[PDB]
Amino acid sequence: HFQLQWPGARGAFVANDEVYFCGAHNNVTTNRTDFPLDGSGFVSIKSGHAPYTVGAIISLETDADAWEDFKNSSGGDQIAIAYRQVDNSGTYCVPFNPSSLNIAGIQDGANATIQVVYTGGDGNLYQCADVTFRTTVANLNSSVCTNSTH
Numbered sequence: 001h002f003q004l005q006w007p008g009a010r011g012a013f014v015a016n017d018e019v020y021f022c023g024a025h026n027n028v029t030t031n032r033t034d035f036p037l038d039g040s041g042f043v044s045i046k047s048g049h050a051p052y053t054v055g056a057i058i059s060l061e062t063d064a065d066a067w068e069d070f071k072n073s074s075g076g077d078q079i080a081i082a083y084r085q086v087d088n089s090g091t092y093c094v095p096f097n098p099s100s101l102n103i104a105g106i107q108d109g110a111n112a113t114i115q116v117v118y119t120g121g122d123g124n125l126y127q128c129a130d131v132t133f134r135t136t137v138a139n140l141n142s143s144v145c146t147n148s149t150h
C-alpha cells in the first residue's frame with residue numbers, strides 16, 4: 001500500500017479504501033496544492049512493500065469525480081506518469097513537468113487531479129491529489145523528493 005507525500009492527497013490515507021477510486025475520496029476537494037509548470041514539480045510517494053508497479057493518470061476536470069474524467073477522447077487513460085516497476089520500499093519520487101504532456105488545458109490557473117495507480121500484489125490501489133498548475137511556486141521544499149533503498 002502507499003501514501004502520497006507531495007502533493008497531498010484529497011483526504012486521509014486509509015489502507016482498506018485504496019481499492020476504490022481516489023481511495024474512496026470520490027468527490028473533488030477545494031483545498032488544492034499549487035503545482036509548478038517550470039519543471040521543479042514532482043510526485044512523491046511512500047510504499048510499505050516492494051516490488052510494486054506505479055504510474056499516474058490525470059484529469060483536467062475541476063470536478064474529477066469518476067474514472068471517465070481521466071480518459072481521453074479515444075477511451076484510454078490519460079497517462080501523466082508512465083508505469084514502471086519499483087524495487088525498493090519507502091519513499092519513491094519522480095519529477096513531473098505537466099508541460100511535457102500531449103494534453104489540452106495545461107496552463108497557469110488550470111485545475112487537475114493526479115491519480116496515482118499502484119499494484120504491489122495486494123490489489124489495484126489508488127490515491128488522488130487535487131492541484132492547480134502555476135507557472136512557478138515559491139515555498140516548494142524538494143527535500144521530501146528522494147528514492148529510498150529499503
Ligand SMILES: *[C@@H]1O[C@H](CO)[C@@H](O)[C@H](O)[C@H]1NC(C)=O
Binds near residue numbers: 008
Ligand atoms: C484538504 O482538506 C481536507 C479536509 O480538511 C484534508 O483532509 C486534506 O488533507 C487537505 N488536502 C491537502 C492537499 O492539504
Ligand SMILES: *[C@@H]1O[C@H](CO)[C@@H](O)[C@H](O)[C@H]1NC(C)=O
Binds near residue numbers: 026027065
Ligand atoms: C459527491 O458528489 C455527488 C455528485 O454531486 C453527490 O451525489 C454525492 O452526494 C457526493 N458525496 C459526498 C460524500 O458528499
Ligand SMILES: *[C@@H]1O[C@H](CO)[C@@H](O)[C@H](O)[C@H]1NC(C)=O
Binds near residue numbers: 029030031062
Ligand atoms: C479550480 O478549483 C478551485 C478550488 O476548488 C475553484 O475555486 C475554481 O473555481 C476551480 N476552477 C474552475 C475553472 O472551476
Ligand SMILES: *[C@@H]1O[C@H](CO)[C@@H](O)[C@H](O)[C@H]1NC(C)=O
Binds near residue numbers: 072073074075078079
Ligand atoms: C488515450 O490514452 C491511451 C493510453 O491509455 C493512448 O494509447 C491513446 O493513444 C490515447 N488516445 C488519444 C486520442 O490521445
Ligand SMILES: *[C@@H]1O[C@H](CO)[C@@H](O)[C@H](O)[C@H]1NC(C)=O
Binds near residue numbers: 094145
Ligand atoms: C527515483 O528513481 C526513478 C527511477 O525509477 C528516477 O526516475 C527518479 O528521478 C528518482 N528520483 C530521485 C529523487 O532520484
Ligand SMILES: [Cu+2]
Binds near residue numbers: 001002048049120122
Ligand atoms: Cu500493500
